[PDB]
Each structure stands twice: as structure tokens, then as C-alpha cells.
Symmetry: D2
């Protein structure tokens, strides 16, 4: 029986102690504490001694919505991928393309209230309280077109059967920049799944390109086999899912194929009342077999832009020595 | 300047008057009233004849669906097909009231499965362990027996066999929309959304069609009968061309995610939708595309600067049937 | 085992049938259906044959946040009070004052996005997507001051011991206008509780008045006795609570005094994750004894401006004959 | 123009740098960074000396609390005292870092009760029937035993007897703030927020003080010892005068409801606060005062037009300790 107690600033400011105190603070602070414990359990299982990716004792799936790549959480995710701390990525199309675009031009801070008419008149696109100039996408187009030319050529003459994961690996290799999530993912043989890869600017570009160079095919069937087999052949699995939608369901349903994940942490701002998959508590997933009945899953109800860097500080970044 | 005033029940339960009074009630009631006006504007435009010039341009797609003065995109999250909103959507599709559907994979498969076995009412709080032990799957406060998916497997597997054979011997290049049309034709049931969609030449887009039970089945099927391809590139061309060659467009988007962005992004290709109504429970603060206001879409060119879009912040299970009652259902005579 | 099924518009548009179909539609539509059933159960219990208010077989407490009086839900609430359909009102201070102010000057439709600087420069105050001109409050001041003079005089010479409920009764009598909730409440001997009655424009006015005419006392202790005894001596109780905060807790805690309400319907947009009383599910209230263990309470997760008029249409307005 | 960039953990776990990087991370991380800046602006102003002219005007209240160049109002919902945020608030009050407190009744009583018995961790999903049967009360994912309130009754009843006697024999005119000061003096415990508040002459306002357990006790007490009066009118004068005679004001408001409006409305009386930070989980769509953006308050004159207020959309149990770490705790030396 753990008593409720907050951090006492009469101690001064020890940030480690402050973060530790979340566990006994209550409400979502307590859930954050539980999430730290669950992610540390995944890491410790992964470090136990026992696709071209070599198996470890715990396969960790990391999912995140596209806007988190628009955000500075791009840097957090890149760090985990760079150091081979997770095994599978799932993100929607924006989450792919904006990582690449950020190697060409930056995204800027703005405000949620900025009016669309005036932004559009000035060639600026709004993402929440962020701003992306039109020119960023012009640079993306210039960079991407010759790559898409090569991909079509390789498909039609070298027998390459493109899927989203294979395209994402290629784009990461091409961007050739260590600030990029997907550069690191391909270097470290971490596959990235994104079944609706056409839903975004990369889609726009594929679309425009296809009238100059028809023929590109992106198959989603083989990518389903690939993600599901990552779960089926795992010794243990953990799911860390930031946001909802496709990224959440796709990871959770892959884990249904092994009769459920062993560990699970959700950080999202959705709620159950609307019947949404996004908003479903981890315990809904237990009814399906996506999370094992004996698992102790955790959801933090919060914006991941606040919570994820703190979670990484207290988990993966603490075990940096073991990952090298 | 409009004064705030709610419906006065001293007048009795005059339902039409009650619904009209939402417009002057405030908060989301007022946004509902605005949504009714915006959808009625789409419908009024749709029923306007095409001039010679407009007909020429609108006829530049290869689809055999007859031309109207307003191409209406209807998007909905999968859970809304789990819900009774399935019946609302089916009605609109049955009577050619909308032109393009976008839904995620659950929103395809569960329409088909509901022709085989029903979904039941439950409660949000039911615990997963006991449900799993009794072979019941939870969708919010709804319940789907394991047996529903067994029936789906039995129905679907022979269709998947035919699809692979048609691919390999007849050169069929499958995409999600083509598969959804075929599944609708196969289910052959007037209670099905997708039966009516294919019958009425209304394309359905679902670029992550593998994300659900239909995916499970494709996956298992592929080990006995390998090589089925679902191309998403051709389907991107198809949805975007629906927007590009429209005289006007309206978007009616229930929920967020892929369904919302995919429709809105198609409309960027024509420099923006003329009309838009969002009904969703998302909020902007998290930076989500789901929670972005219509005015964010204006910055991108997905909604015209001159448009007067509306978002209703509510569960669509409450709002959508009311919206349809006051809009499409009022003009049903024109659609027959 | 009830099957999920929505209203079939091939029937045409029968609004009664459409509303009935919410029950089998799922998510919050199903909760709305359950709410209709629970409120009808309250009404039917109230109509069973057995403070100056005569007891009925079910005492119904109606609570609502202040903004719902800013809204057109003012008209919905007024109707119920006018016809003696509920027994006790609880609202916060705005919910009192704006009912009175609306008899003097209207509130207007606006938009949530309107900027504060320009509104303030034009003498307009924003309430969500509503607008209240400064002049409305000038009219309120002119109307209220001579009443406050009388109240002080009655306190100091006729021994009147003012409380929020007594003040609200008096203001209702004074406004003398059948569009007013509180005019009807006092006419029908329905008490109104508002322990923080100073938190709003009526507060501002009491504050300004007190420097011209010092002495007014508003006691909250006697009003606690009054509300709690409404619950203690009831044969049965029902709670209908629109929104959260003081209005929700105050009604629910009164019902703790009788060991719990027999029926309960919440309609609010709050969520549990933040630990808020506003967001607590009805089942939290069961742990306290505020709702009986054998009750079947219902929460609808929605804006009451949408849901409440529909609920009244299917419940109280259907039994209009029995209430006359 | 500031570029979006998150903290790079290749630099190691440098916590100060990690927290500073929230400002360029986007969404609510950026709003957190803005809140840190806004609170530090309040603190910097507070530590600025009062000029002769400013001192004269600021000294026009009867309170004996020493004058500062920025009067800081701290508001919090009751549940935040149920939580460990009680410790965060106590620290600020202990060291005279804020000037006026506003909380609802739970936020008073539970601070006192925590000196008598602890609150425990639980879970949101725990069912009410079984909790009730075991004499346990649920607050979100926290748990309070029945016995805690028995202990509160035993402690409080003799104090209520003294208060009634002082009213009737010494002419004491009780208000919520005066009662809260007395209860703080009586609890006589350095872990208590209200012990420190009364010691440091920080008034606490709670106009619905009867809405909770303290109310329960007053109610039961009144049948044995009738006639206790709690006047809310005098307390309105007292809070509003704190704003009217301030050189500058800042508002730090955790959660919504009475606590938020009461602080903001007091600041309308001086034509608006100079600085404001809201941390709450409410949204604007429902028309709620709780969910109104800071810019709504600008229309009323509760926040100055020239102010740059900030709302962080998050559970304060996560955000507030981080905010304090980066603001008040950094300047602790100046407050001693
Ligand atoms: N930058 C972009 O957002 C962007 C760019 C191009 C394309 N798109 C397209 O939009 C579509 C929908 O985007 P999506 O599926 O990535 O998610 P989304 O933005 O629709 O979010 C889905 C849900 O995830 C949760 N969520 C979102 N942001 C969160 C946060 N910061 N913290 C916690 N929870 C959060 C919310 O509850 C939200 O409703 C995708 O197909 C995507 O490719 C997005
Ligand atoms: N029945 C199912 O929900 C189901 C079944 C199988 C697969 N899936 C898969 O789950 C994935 C995610 O589902 P999704 O993208 O359809 O949406 P989702 O359920 O994740 O919801 C996305 C957002 O839409 C909004 N929303 C959801 N329900 C709403 C309602 N009733 N009213 C208003 N707004 C609402 C919410 O803000 C939510 O965060 C999809 O790829 C889908 O195929 C879902
Ligand atoms: N018009 C006004 O709102 C107004 C005017 C003057 C004073 N005030 C003061 O503001 C203070 C706080 O206001 P409050 O306590 O009345 O409530 P609030 O507006 O703080 O709302 C509390 C909670 O109730 C729920 N809620 C609000 N509106 C809702 C809706 N339309 N549908 C469903 N749920 C809803 C929300 O979850 C919200 O967080 C009060 O003391 C009041 O006197 C308000
Ligand atoms: N422990 C308790 O909660 C408790 C105990 C006894 C009595 N009560 C009574 O309940 C009534 C209502 O409580 P209240 O007015 O203190 O607020 P509340 O709990 O009703 O919350 C009001 C709004 O504040 C916001 N909020 C709540 N918790 C938050 C968090 N952790 N972070 C960010 N925002 C948050 C939410 O939007 C919420 O709707 C009061 O009169 C109080 O005395 C409460
Ligand atoms: N193998 C298919 C799994 C489908 C799970 C769908 C869960 C949807 N849950 C909500 N919409 N709440
Ligand atoms: N043509 C590409 C359009 C991409 C739009 C992405 C908008 C994302 N908005 C958020 N608030 N996430
Ligand atoms: N008789 C006093 C009852 C106090 C109940 C407080 C309940 C608070 N619940 C949350 N904050 N979730
Ligand atoms: N001096 C009286 C101020 C009253 C302000 C009320 C603002 C209510 N705002 C909402 N969004 N409810």
C-alpha cells in the first residue's frame, strides 16, 4: 500500500528524484511512473542472453503518429533507432516524409490560432503550433524525383517488388544524414511499416511522378507478412505506442498473431467514450488477445511531446552503456 | 446578429422545430445548426444542373458514375461501421447521395461481417480477461463474438482464391478500392454499404486495408496461396482524380486519422474543397491531424479560403443521424 | 442480448423512431438511450402516489453549469421548472445572473476564434461562441442596486438572514418575467443552491454595492442544511447533472446523506484521467455512498447543449399531461 | 523564427538541457517552455524593488503581508491536494513565493486530513460496490479510507465548538478565509499548506467551503451546536482588494471551475492580470469557463491586452512539479 506523496523541493532540485516522485504523485504522474517501470522491464528482458535482423530476448515495437515527427520528438525517436534500442517502427506517412524533409529544411514554431487565409497567402502550412514553408516541399520534390526514377527502373528491370518498408529503407539510405530516423533505421536493419504510405506529401510526389514515369507499385500485402512475422517469431514482445490510429492498431494486431504482447505502454490523448480504437484502454486489447492476460500494461493520458522525452530519460538513456 | 434562444417545449414536442433551434442554442448545438446549413449547401449545389462547360470538365475521369455539380466525399472511422451508423452510411450510399467513400480496414470488413452475424451491445468497463475466456471481443461498449470472424474466414477464403487466380491468369491488378468493390459484389446483400457502393459505382478508398481482420485473412491465405498484391499507388491516382475533375466538392468527415487526411489531401489537388463538415472528438492541442480545426486545412489549400467550413465536436453516433435527417433525408425525392 | 442497429432512413424521417434508435446505435448514442430510460424511471417514480415544498415519491435534483444558462439550454431548464418537474436546482453564480440578465438584454451568437483584444475594444465579452455586450451588465447593475438596498434594509431591521437560495428566490420574484428560470423556481417553491454565489457578475455587483451600502451577509451554512435535508427526507431521489464542478459534487454529496441516490444521469464533457471530480464516472460515486449500489446510473459523454433538449423531448415533455 | 528541435540524448541525460528543449519541441512541450518563461517573468517582477510611488499604492490594503512588485495568485482544484501536488503547493506557500491561494473545499480539508492519515495509490477501474463494502473511497486512481474522515471528525468538532463560541461571545464574523487560517493554525504541522499559509499571512479563498467533508462536519455539528455563519460577501471584498491594489499581478491556475474564474474575476477589477499561466485538461468546445482559452479572458478585461498568457493542456500532476523546478525552485535563495 503506497502512500501518496509529491517531491519535496526543500531537498533542492534533483531532477532524477523529481521524476521518480511522479510514481507516488497520483493521476497521470503515477501512470508515468508505471510506464517507466514497464519500459525498464522490456529493456531488462531485451538485455537477457538468448528478415536479416538478429533476434534478441525482447522485440520492441515503437509506433508514433506523424505529427510527432513534425515535433522535436523526431530527435528522441532518432536516438533510440540510432542505438538499436528498438526493433520495429510503425508510423504513418507524414512520420516518414517529414524526417526526410527536416534534413533539407527546418520546421518552425508558430501558434495554433494563426489564421489559414493569411498563412496560405504567405506560402506557409500549419501543423498545430508549428509552421512548414511551401519551399520545404519544393526541396523534397527536387530531392525525391531522381530516386523515384531509380525505384521504377529497379522494379521493371531488376525485379524489385516495392512495399512501404522497402521504400522507407531506400529513402533513409538516400537521405544519408545522421539526423534522420530512417537513415539510422536502414543502417541498423530496423524495418519501418506504414501501410498507408500514400497519405501525405510522399504520396503527392509519387502521384506527380507517376505521370512523368508511370509504373511504380507499392504492395501492402508483403509488408503485412513482414510485420506479423516479427511478432510471431519473437521470444518476448513489448509495445511502446505514441498516439493512436493505424500505428496503434497495426502494432497491436501484429502481436495478436503471437497471442499477445508481454509488455505494453500507450501514451496518447484519446479517450474511450467515442468507441475509437485510438481511445481504447489497454484492457480492451486484452479481450482480443493483443496483450497477454498476465501482462501489466500502462496508458499515460497526455501529449507525448511532454511525456516521451521524460520516459526515455528514465529508461533507454539510462541503459546506454548496455546498448554499446 | 442572431440572439441566443433555445427551443421552448411549451410549444410541444415539434421535432423539426426542436432541431432547427439547435442553431441558436450555442456551443456545439450551434455548430450542428451550421453543419446542417453546410451539408444542405452541398446538396443544393449537387442538384444544380451542369452547364455545358462544367459537364465537359467533370466528364474527364474514366469512372462511369454520372456527373453532378458537387462531388461529395464521405469519410468515417472503422468504429462507426461497428456502430449503428453503418445503417446511416448504407442509406446514403444506396441512394447515390455521396460520391466517394473513405474508411479504414475495420470499416470495410465489419460491414461484410454484419451480413453474416450481428454485433451486440455491451459496456466499456467489461474486463478483457473474462471476455477473452468467453470468446468475446470488445469494441468500446460493443461486443463481437469470436464466431463472427470464423464465419468471415469461411466466406472470404474462396474469394481470395479467385482473386489470386484472376491476378495470375487474367492480369488483374488489385488495389484496395478494387478489392472492396469485389467484396461488395460478393456479399450480395442490400444491408451492406459496399454492396450498394459497387452497384452505384461509388469507389471506396482504404490505403491501409491490411490493418484489421481482412488483413489477418489475407495473411493466413498467403501461406497456402501466395502472391496476392494490393497496390496503393493506383488508388492514390484514383482518389485524387475524383477531386481534380469535380465542379465543386464537399467533404463530410466523421472521425479523424487516415480517413480525414486522405479526403482533405485529395481536395488539396484542386486547390481546396468548397464545403466541409467535420464531426469528431479530437482536439487541436496535441498537434494531431485528427484534432486540427478546418482552418488549419485552409493554410494548406485543402479547404478554399472562401469556404465556411464547420466542425462539430461530438461523438458522431449522436450527431450523424440527426444531420442526415435534416439534410439528405429531406431531399430523398430528388435522389430517386 | 441486444443487436447493434441504426435507424433506417428508408422508413423516412420519424424523429421519435430516430431518437429511439440511439439505444441500439452504440457508443454515446447507446448511453443517451440509457439516460432516457433512467430519467423516465425517475418520472414514473415521481408520479406514484405517496421547506414549504410538498413531498413527492421522487425528489429530482437538477444541476447545471453556468454556461448552460448562457446557452439556449436556459429555455429547456426554464420549461422543467415552470411545470414543477424537478424539485431542487443547483447552479453556479453565472447560472443565476445570466438568467436574470437575459430578461433585460439578449446574448448573441459569435465564434470561438474571435480575438480578445478586438472584442474588448468594442465592449463585447466572449462566452465560448457566444457574445455578451458590456451594456447588458450596465442594465443588470441598474436593475439590481435598488433590490440589494432592500435586502440590506430587510436584514438589519426585519431580521432576514440571507443565504444564496433566499437571494435567488428574491431575485426571481423581482425579475417578474416568465422567461426566467428563477421567476418560476420561486413561484413553484423550488429552491436553488449556489454556494459560491459571489463568483460572477452578481458578485461584482454585491461588491460594488457594499461600498455604497455596507452590511450584506450571505451565509452558506444554512444553505448546506437546506440542501442536505432535501435529500435526507426524500422517499426516493434522482440526480440529473449537466456538467461538473460544484454543481455535480454538491448534489451528489447531498445524496450521500441519505446513503445514495436511487437514479442518476450525468451529461458532461469531462474525463476521469485527470483525477477530477468533474470527470469521475458515476461508479466512483458508488464507492462514497453518493449513488446506491443497486442503482443503474448513466453518463453521456457529450456537450449538454446537444444532448439535453433531446433528452427532455423523450422524457419530461412526454409526460406533460401528468404534470398538469 | 525558432526552429523545431528536440533534446538530443546523444548529449547524455542532462536534465536542465532536456527541460529547456521542451520549448523547441512543439505542441504542449512548447507551451510548457512558454509557461516557464511566463512564471519566471512573474518572479523577476516580484523581486524588483517597489518605487516610492508603487509602494504607496500597494500599501493601501489592511493585510500585514509584506509588499512585492508582483502579487501572485495560485489556484488549484481539490483533487490536486488529494495528489502529491499538495507537497509542491506547500513548498511554494512555506517560502512566501505566492501571495493568494484559491481552492475548492476538498483542497482545504484534504491537506488537513493528510496530517492525520495518508491517501493511497489505487486504480481508476476499481469498482464502487466492493470499495464501499470495504470502507474505501475512490478519488481517481487514489484511495481514501473511511477512517481518515473519522479522524477528521474527532479533530475538527472541538474546533467548531470554539468557533461558534467565539462568534457568539467575542463577535467574530467568520468567512471561509478566516476559517481556513484558523484550521491551519490548529493543525500546527509543517507538512500542511494551510499551516504555512496562515503563518505567512497568505489568505486562502474558497467561496463554496461547504462543498465537501468540512461541510459534512459543519452540517452534523449544527444540530448539536447551531448558528455558525460563514459569510462569503466579506471574502469577495478581501480577494478583489488583493488584485486592485497590486503593482502587478500574475495568475497561476491549475485546473478549472471556481478556482479559475474567482482568480480571473478578481483581476478584472484592476483591468487585468499582467501575467497568466493556465494548466488544465479542459477544452473550449463545450462553452465551459474551465475550458476557455486565456484569450477569452482578454475580451473581459481579466488579462491585459499586452499580456502574453500561456495555457498548457495537460494533467497538472505531470506538469506542475516540472514548472516549479524550472522557476520558483531556481530562485529559492531570493525567497529566504
Ligand atoms: N504531420 C502530420 O501530422 C501529417 C503529415 C502528412 C500526412 N499526415 C497524415 O495524417 C494521417 C493521420 O495522422 P496520424 O494517423 O499519424 O495521427 P492523428 O494525428 O490522426 O492522431 C491520431 C490520434 O493519436 C493521438 N495523438 C495524436 N498526437 C498525439 C500526441 N502528441 N500525444 C499523444 N497522443 C496523440 C490523438 O488521440 C489522435 O486523435 C496519416 O495517414 C498521416 O500520414 C499527417
Ligand atoms: N472497429 C474498429 O475500430 C476496427 C476494427 C479493425 C481494425 N481497426 C483498425 O484500427 C485503425 C485505427 O482506426 P481508425 O483510423 O478508423 O480511427 P480511430 O478509431 O483510431 O479514431 C481516430 C480518431 O477519430 C475520432 N473518432 C473516433 N471515433 C469517433 C466518433 N464516434 N465520433 C467522432 N469522432 C471519432 C477520434 O478523435 C479518434 O482519435 C484502422 O487502421 C482500422 O482498420 C479498427
Ligand atoms: N457563463 C459562465 O460560464 C459564467 C459566468 C459568470 C461566472 N462564471 C463562473 O465560473 C465558475 C466555473 O463555472 P462552472 O462551475 O459553472 O463550470 P465550468 O464551466 O467550469 O465547467 C466545469 C466542467 O463541466 C463540464 N461542462 C461544461 N460545459 C459543459 C457542457 N456544455 N456540456 C457538458 N459538460 C460541460 C466540463 O467538463 C467542465 O470542465 C463558476 O463559479 C461560475 O459562477 C461562469
Ligand atoms: N478531492 C476532491 O476532488 C474533492 C473532495 C471533496 C469535495 N470536492 C468538491 O468537488 C467540487 C468540484 O471540484 P473542483 O472545482 O476542485 O474541480 P473538478 O475536479 O471538478 O475539476 C474542474 C476542471 O478542472 C480541470 N482539472 C481537474 N483536474 C485537473 C488536473 N489534474 N490537471 C489539469 N486540469 C484539471 C478539469 O478540466 C476539470 O473539469 C468542489 O466544490 C470540491 O470542494 C472535491
Ligand atoms: N484481428 C483484428 C483485431 C480488430 C480489433 C479492433 C478493435 C477496435 N476497438 C475499438 N474501435 N474500440
Ligand atoms: N499535401 C500534404 C499535406 C500534409 C498536411 C499535414 C497536416 C498535419 N496537421 C497536423 N495538425 N498534424
Ligand atoms: N462527503 C465528502 C465526499 C467527497 C468526495 C470527493 C470525490 C472526489 N473525486 C475525484 N476528485 N475524482
Ligand atoms: N465579471 C464577470 C465575468 C464573467 C465571465 C464569464 C466568462 C464565462 N466564459 C465561458 N466560456 N463560460
Amino acid at each position: 500500500s503506497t502512500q501518496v506523496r509529491g517531491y519535496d523541493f526543500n531537498r533542492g532540485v534533483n531532477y532524477r528524484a523529481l521524476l521518480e516522485a511522479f510514481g507516488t504523485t497520483g493521476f497521470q504522474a503515477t501512470n508515468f511512473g508505471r510506464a517507466v517501470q514497464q519500459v525498464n522491464a522490456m529493456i531488462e528482458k531485451k538485455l537477457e542472453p538468448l528478415s536479416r535482423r538478429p533476434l534478441t530476448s525482447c522485440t520492441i515495437f515503437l509506433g508514433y503518429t506523424s505529427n510527432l515527427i513534425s515535433s522535436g520528438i523526431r530527435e528522441t525517436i532518432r536516438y533510440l533507432v540510432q542505438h538499436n534500442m528498438v526493433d520495429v517502427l510503425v508510423t504513418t506517412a507524414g512520420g516518414v516524409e517529414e524526417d526526410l524533409i527536416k534534413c533539407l529544411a527546418p520546421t518552425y514554431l508558430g501558434e495554433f490560432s494563426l489564421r489559414g487565409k493569411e498563412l496560405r497567402e504567405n506560402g506557409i502550412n500549419r501543423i498545430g503550433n508549428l509552421l512548414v514553408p511551401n519551399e520545404n516541399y519544393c526541396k523534397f520534390e527536387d530531392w525525391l524525383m531522381p530516386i523515384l526514377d531509380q525505384m521504377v527502373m529497379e522494379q521493371n528491370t531488376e525485379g524489385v517488388k516495392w512495399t512501404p518498408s522497402k521504400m522507407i529503407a531506400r529513402l533513409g539510405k538516400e537521405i544519408n544524414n545522421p539526423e534522420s530516423v530512417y537513415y539510422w533505421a536502414q543502417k541498423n536493419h530496423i524495418p519501418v511499416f506504414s501501410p498507408a504510405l500514400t497519405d501525405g506529401s510522399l504520396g503527392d510526389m509519387i502521384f506527380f511522378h507517376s505521370y512523368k514515369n508511370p509504373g511504380l507499385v507499392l504492395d501492402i500485402v508483403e509488408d503485412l507478412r513482414l510485420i506479423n512475422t516479427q511478432a510471431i517469431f519473437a521470444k518476448c514482445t513489448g509495445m511502446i505506442i505514441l498516439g493512436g490510429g493505424v500505428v496503434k492498431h497495426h502494432i497491436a494486431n501484429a502481436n495478436l498473431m503471437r497471442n499477445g504482447a508481454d509488455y505494453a505502454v500507450y501514451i496518447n490523448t484519446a479517450q474511450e467514450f467515442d468507441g475509437s480504437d485510438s481511445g481504447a484502454r489497454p484492457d480492451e486489447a486484452v479481450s482480443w488477445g493483443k496483450i497477454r492476460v498476465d501482462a501489466q500494461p500502462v496508458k499515460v493520458y497526455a501529449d507525448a511531446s511532454l511525456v516521451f522525452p521524460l520516459l526515455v530519460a528514465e529508461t533507454f538513456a539510462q541503459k546506454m552503456d548496455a546498448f554499446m
